[PDB]
């Protein structure tokens, strides 16, 4: 039995024609206090997988160490560690999914929601979710926390089903992700303006973007709003 | 559920309903609440479905192992006590079982043992177990005599379940009848309450509370 202390908010992601995009802001909240601002919640594994984690940060750091150790262990007695026997997104996910469910079954969970985004060796897009309960599901768009409520509706307007994936380009997909991050900044009280974004493409590979900012915000209309009903000054 | 079994001149009658509930949701009308342990032993099931079903089939395995080791069919007393000693180990853990081990052996004769999940084990001539046990008792006790014929005893057992199936909201479906003799148990059919009630009402002239 735990209670989360230092927390990370929404992780959002979607599939596009050649790969997957994933994003998450750089905040480490301590309740209502926006305590830590340099927190990286996207963690790459190899050159083909990115694990996005929300929830308790101490448990996130534990998961980082496991993934780091997983890469090391895979390299042992493995001449094809950087080729045919390299770590796949599906391997990394299933490992985490196993751990998450084992921990919930011992009544001592890792208080997180995790999204493993990547590209398989055969070029197929991989995007799957797992959380503290060990619950797993996959979808063309996946999001955690407030992202599930606000980002998914927006991302589903682009990719509403499987057949929309080949029709969606990386430009259109990234634009929707960046828009969703702005909406979350408007409406999620435990979010920050600064965020990281990662693209895993089957052709161009892993592109990790740091220190992005929400921009092109609409605040001007606020000046016209006076009082709460009858005030005209 | 409603289950009964009583001892009489011509052996043992065993009768059960077939309903299974999850709260007010009627989950099944076709549950087998009598377990056939061997040609001379029967076990009735009331309470938690899984608890009864799992541990009474387990009981059957223990009874088989007895007759392999001892080259002799297990006694009704020993069979019941295996089950009672088992549930006693789980006392407090929350098992829910109201069972009756009915059978015949040479040394014992016809015998009935009531065994429940809080460790109670009682030998007796008449028992009714389940949510509708009281309704079954009312009809059974008021019509019971030791000198009942096999035909009348079978009907009284059937009629007592019907009585409970009617009044108890958590009993119904159909009646399963068994008759245990010196030669072993004999199945006396599945009787759907849907047809049985009206057949009994018309022929017997009872159930005048219901709109005919």
């Amino acid at each position: 039995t735990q209670q989360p202390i230092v927390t990370g908010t929404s992780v959002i992601s979607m599939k596009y024609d050649n790969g997957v995009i994933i994003a998450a802001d750089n905040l480490g909240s301590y309740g209502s206090l926006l305590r830590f601002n340099g927190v990286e919640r996207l963690i790459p594994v190899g050159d083909n997988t990115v694990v996005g984690i929300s929830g308790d940060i101490s448990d996130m750091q534990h998961i980082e160490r496991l993934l780091k150790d997983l890469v090391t262990e895979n390299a042992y007695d493995n001449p094809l560690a950087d080729a045919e026997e390299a770590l796949e997104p599906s391997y990394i996910f299933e490992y985490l999914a196993t751990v998450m469910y084992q921990r919930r079954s011992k009544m001592n969970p890792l208080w997180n929601a995790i999204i493993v985004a990547g590209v398989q060796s055969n070029g197929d897009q991989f995007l799957r979710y797992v959380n503290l309960l060990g619950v797993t599901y996959s979808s063309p768009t996946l999001a955690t926390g407030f992202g599930a409520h606000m980002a998914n509706p927006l991302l589903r307007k682009v990719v509403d089903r499987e057949s929309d994936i080949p029709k969606t380009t990386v430009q259109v997909a990234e634009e929707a992700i960046v828009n969703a991050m702005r909406v979350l900044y408007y409406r999620d009280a435990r979010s920050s303006r600064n965020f990281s974004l990662a693209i895993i493409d089957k052709n161009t590979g892993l592109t990790f973007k740091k220190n992005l900012q929400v921009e092109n915000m609409k605040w001007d209309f606020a000046k016209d709003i006076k009082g709460y009903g009858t005030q005209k000054i | 559920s409603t289950t009964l079994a009583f001892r009489f001149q011509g052996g043992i009658i065993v009768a059960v309903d077939s309903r299974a509930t999850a709260g007010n949701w009627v989950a099944s009308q076709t549950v087998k609440k009598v377990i056939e342990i061997n040609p001379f032993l029967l076990g009735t099931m009331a309470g938690g479905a899984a608890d009864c079903q799992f541990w009474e089939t387990w009981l059957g395995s223990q009874c088989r192992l007895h007759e392999l080791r001892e080259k002799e069919r297990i006694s009704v007393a020993a069979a019941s006590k295996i089950l009672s000693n088992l549930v006693y180990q789980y006392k407090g853990a929350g098992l829910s079982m109201g069972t009756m081990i009915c059978g015949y052996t040479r040394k014992e004769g016809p015998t009935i043992y009531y065994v429940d999940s809080d460790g109670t084990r009682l030998k007796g001539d008449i028992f009714c177990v389940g949510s509708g046990q009281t309704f079954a008792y009312g009809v059974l006790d008021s019509n019971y005599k030791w000198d009942l014929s096999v035909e009348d005893a079978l009907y009284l057992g059937k009629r007592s379940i019907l009585a409970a199936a009617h009044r108890d909201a958590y009993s119904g479906g159909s009646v399963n009848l068994y008759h245990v003799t010196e030669d072993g148990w004999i199945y006396h059919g599945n009787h759907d309450v849907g047809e049985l009630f009206w057949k009994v009402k018309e022929e017997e002239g009872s159930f005048n509370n219901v709109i005919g």
Binding site: - | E70, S75, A77, A78, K81, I82, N85, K107
Partner: protein, 240 residues
């Protein structure tokens, strides 16, 4: 824990520790079991190099396992106590779970299973003991007599003897015991038992113990004078 495999096979296919345990039985005082038509009698030798004994308190050779079953033995006395204790506990355990006392076959099978377990368990030696288990099953009037031995094998006997000079008394029983007509009465069965011990014992004074077991938990041990009467009667008939 001490793990050593003490009981092991030899090139010729023998387990010497089990066979040396039989030698300990062969050293032990003679014990005999004879079953009649409606009874079983257990006879036991007591060596007479021990005078100044206190027979009130000295452990008796025949031991009650339950009210309806008895156990005598030949071999190591200290080892026998362990088997008797285990058997007595299993007797009460059986009554508790089965709601019925043990059969003589069941009790024998248990004791024999214990003896066997010590022949292939690490860190232990076999029991230097062979037993004669006798009694009557619950609600039964057929006499039962069983034998066990260190190896763990057990079997039923019409009449049997174990211990020192047992081959002599077995020879006697083999020609004197009729399968078609066993000792019809208690007196006949006791006499045949005493006769068989008189082939080996020495004197019929405080050297022979006799215990009679009858149906429905009817067990009694004979006193010196009672046994001496059989000894006196047999010797007078012998001079012929």
């Amino acid at each position: 824990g001490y793990d050593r495999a003490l009981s092991i096979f030899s090139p010729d296919g023998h387990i010497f520790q089990v066979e040396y345990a039989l030698e300990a039985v062969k050293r032990g005082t003679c014990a005999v079991g004879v079953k009649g038509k409606n009874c079983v009698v257990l006879g036991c030798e007591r060596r007479s190099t021990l005078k100044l004994q206190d027979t009130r308190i000295t452990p008796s050779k025949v031991s009650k396992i339950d009210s309806h079953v008895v156990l005598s033995f030949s071999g190591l006395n200290a080892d026998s106590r362990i088997l008797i204790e285990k058997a007595r506990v299993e007797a009460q355990s059986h009554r508790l779970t089965l709601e019925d006392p043990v059969t003589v076959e069941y009790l024998t099978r248990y004791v024999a299973g214990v003896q066997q377990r010590y022949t292939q368990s690490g860190g232990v030696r076999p029991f230097g003991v062979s037993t004669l288990i006798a009694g009557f099953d619950p609600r039964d009037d057929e006499p039962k007599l069983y034998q066990t031995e260190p190896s763990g094998i057990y079997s039923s006997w019409s009449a049997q003897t174990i211990g020192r000079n047992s081959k002599t008394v077995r020879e006697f029983l083999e020609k004197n015991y009729d399968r078609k007509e066993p000792p019809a009465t208690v007196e006949e069965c006791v006499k045949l038992t005493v006769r068989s011990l008189l082939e080996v014992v020495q004197t019929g004074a405080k050297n022979i113990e006799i215990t009679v077991v009858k149906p429905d938990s009817d067990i009694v041990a004979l006193s010196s004078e009672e046994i001496n009467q059989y000894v006196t009667q047999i010797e007078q008939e012998k001079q012929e």
